[PDB]
Amino acid sequence: MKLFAQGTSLDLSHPHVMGILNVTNSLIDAVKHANLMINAGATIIDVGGESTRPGAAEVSVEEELQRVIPVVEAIAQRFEVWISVDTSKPEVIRESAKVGAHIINDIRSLSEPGALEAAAETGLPVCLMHMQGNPKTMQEAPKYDDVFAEVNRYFIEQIARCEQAGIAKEKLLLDPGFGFGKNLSHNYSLLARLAEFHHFNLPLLVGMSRKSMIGQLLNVGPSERLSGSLACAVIAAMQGAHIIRVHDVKETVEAMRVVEATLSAKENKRYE
Amino acid sequence: SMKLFAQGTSLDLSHPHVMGILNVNSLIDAVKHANLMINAGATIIDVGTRPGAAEVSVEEELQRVIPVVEAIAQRFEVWISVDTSKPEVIRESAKVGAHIINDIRSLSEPGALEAAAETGLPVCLMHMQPKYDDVFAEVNRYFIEQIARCEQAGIAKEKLLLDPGFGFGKNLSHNYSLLARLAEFHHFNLPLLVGMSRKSMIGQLLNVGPSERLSGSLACAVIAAMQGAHIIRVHDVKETVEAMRVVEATLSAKENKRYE
Ligand SMILES: COc1ccc(C(=O)CSc2nc3c(=O)[nH]c(N)nc3[nH]2)cc1
Numbered sequence: 001m002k003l004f005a006q007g008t009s010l011d012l013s014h015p016h017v018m019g020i021l022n023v024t025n026s027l028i029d030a031v032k033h034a035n036l037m038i039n040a041g042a043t044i045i046d047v048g049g050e051s052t053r054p055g056a057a058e059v060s061v062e063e064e065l066q067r068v069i070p071v072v073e074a075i076a077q078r079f080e081v082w083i084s085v086d087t088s089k090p091e092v093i094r095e096s097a098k099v100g101a102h103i104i105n106d107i108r109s110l111s112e113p114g115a116l117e118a119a120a121e122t123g124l125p126v127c128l129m130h131m132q133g134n135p136k137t138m139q140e141a142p143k144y145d146d147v148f149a150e151v152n153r154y155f156i157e158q159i160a161r162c163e164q165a166g167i168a169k170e171k172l173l174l175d176p177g178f179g180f181g182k183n184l185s186h187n188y189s190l191l192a193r194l195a196e197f198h199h200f201n202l203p204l205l206v207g208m209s210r211k212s213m214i215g216q217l218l219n220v221g222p223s224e225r226l227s228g229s230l231a232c233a234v235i236a237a238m239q240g241a242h243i244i245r246v247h248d249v250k251e252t253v254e255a256m257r258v259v260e261a262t263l264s265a266k267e268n269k270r271y272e
Numbered sequence: 273s274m275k276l277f278a279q280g281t282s283l284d285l286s287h288p289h290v291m292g293i294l295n296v297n298s299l300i301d302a303v304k305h306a307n308l309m310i311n312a313g314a315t316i317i318d319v320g321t322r323p324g325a326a327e328v329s330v331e332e333e334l335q336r337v338i339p340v341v342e343a344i345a346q347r348f349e350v351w352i353s354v355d356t357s358k359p360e361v362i363r364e365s366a367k368v369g370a371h372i373i374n375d376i377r378s379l380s381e382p383g384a385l386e387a388a389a390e391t392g393l394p395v396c397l398m399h400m401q402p403k404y405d406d407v408f409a410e411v412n413r414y415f416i417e418q419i420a421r422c423e424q425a426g427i428a429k430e431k432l433l434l435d436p437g438f439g440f441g442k443n444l445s446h447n448y449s450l451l452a453r454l455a456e457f458h459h460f461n462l463p464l465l466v467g468m469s470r471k472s473m474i475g476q477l478l479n480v481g482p483s484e485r486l487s488g489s490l491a492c493a494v495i496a497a498m499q500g501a502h503i504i505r506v507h508d509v510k511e512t513v514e515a516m517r518v519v520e521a522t523l524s525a526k527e528n529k530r531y532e
């Protein structure tokens with residue numbers, strides 16, 4: 001299993017760690033943070049300029065472009081690392097790809113007018129994430145009769161939508177969207193059944209780092225979540241998740257080495 | 273449903289337990305460290321004597337170990353595991369409140385087997401000897417043998433725990449083979465105890481020193497717990513307990529309650 005972008009490839013025969021670069025002197029600091037994450041073993045850096053948090057306010061196209069594009073450009077011309085861009089906006093998609101981004105990682109799964117066409121036009125890999133509702137209301141009262149089945153159905157529908165628009169399946173990644181319109185019990189159901197999403201034969205991307213599913217379980221603040229975060233990452237990686245999106249790159253990469261050593265000693269290379 | 277009974281209390285093995293390592297006033301500090309581990313969520317304290325270490329006389333081992341076991345048993349509700357190979361220490365430990373006899377030698381010293389049987393306590397069987405054909409099969413064979421040896425001495429199967437003995441005459445790939453296949457040891461229907469905390473199986477993989485192995489140790493604990501391991505022996509209790517609550521939340525959402 002392999003992705004292709006910007007003349008290079010990413011080998012997903014083992015887990016990859018994706019370092020979070022939140023850009024909600026800004027430029028110099030962001031590039032220093034990327035550099036530390038690459039040194040710590042991150043092979044993808046995820047650049048995001050619009051808060052995707054519960055209650056988040058929208059940012060203008062011009063402001064997002066100012067936050068994001070100079071960060072993507074600077075990273076693409078200094079390091080060899082892959083770059084994902086965390087955006088919903090057709091223009092940010094286009095401009096990001098122009099300055100070297102490798103993956104479009106939209107929490108809205110290209111739902112914004114023109115996003116689907118912009119993504120297709122780039123030829124880049126696209127991550128389809130499940131979210132119930134939108135960031136302003138998703139956490140008010142998340143509700144499912146069957147969260148796994150409903151996220152599974154969403155991925156069937158969005159894969160088709162993307163194929164229809166000329167995005168080949170081989171470009172797609174799937175992410176169940178931990179914390180995006182889910183209560184604590186919904187999140188743990190998806191984590192527990194994560195391996196079952198492999199039936200699509202597509203890369204799985206997960207992001208649990210420092211999230212509420214750890215916070216509300218342990219009743220701790222956001223700086224006390226490293227152990228819980230590593231536990232989530234290891235649980236996901238043991239079930240064959242391909243990309244783990246995190247704040248704490250060094251510790252995660254170390255945990256992924258242990259997983260890799262364990263999976264390579266196993267006959268069928270996956271827990272289920 | 274799996275439970276152990278000792279000293280008037282029970283251990284509920286329907287979820288994983290964290291066992292904190294206690295290195296042996298010396299007695300005041302041992303109590304203080306026990307207190308810290310209980311506060312971090314350890315439900316078993318392992319009292320002991322690594323491999324390579326200096327052998328000691330019966331008398332010295334009693335003087336080191338018995339007051340500690342006794343002091344913990346008098347002050348705390350926690351279960352107490354004792355790492356010893358000597359029949360005298362097994363006997364005296366049980367008299368002052370130990371719950372589990374954890375012998376790294378699996379009761380091979382003369383008299384140890386009989387002493388353990390007399391106590392009526394739970395007994396942990398650990399594999400120790402690196403070259404193997406199928407490390408899993410050898411360990412598995414060892415368990416069958418030791419179980420039989422214990423049952424023959426009047427130790428009921430319901431008192432036994434199995435430990436594959438990570439780091440103990442095992443190289444890097446043998447250790448990870450045993451970890452990858454841990455869940456297969458459930459066919460005995462006995463509790464599984466594992467100890468990988470800060471070991472060279474992490475140190476060598478990662479090329480880091482003994483104090484930089486927490487993340488790898490946590491990974492090992494999670495990997496074992498996801499496969500239904502019952503007791504995880506660690507140095508870093510708070511962090512392991514947190515990781516275990518995440519495992520527990522995951523396994524409770526799973527209809528199978530285990531990964532294989
Ligand atoms: C303090 O509590 C926190 C709440 C939220 C965070 C975030 O980082 C949320 S942004 C985010 N998540 C995902 C994801 O899961 N998958 C993908 N594909 N993209 C994502 N983007 C961090 C901490």
Ligand SMILES: COc1ccc(C(=O)CSc2nc3c(=O)[nH]c(N)nc3[nH]2)cc1
Binds near residue numbers: 322396435438466468
């Ligand atoms: C730096 O390299 C290290 C080498 C060794 C250590 C130890 O703590 C090993 S003593 C020990 N292990 C076990 C075990 O696995 N199971 C049981 N049941 N009892 C045990 N007693 C730590 C670090």
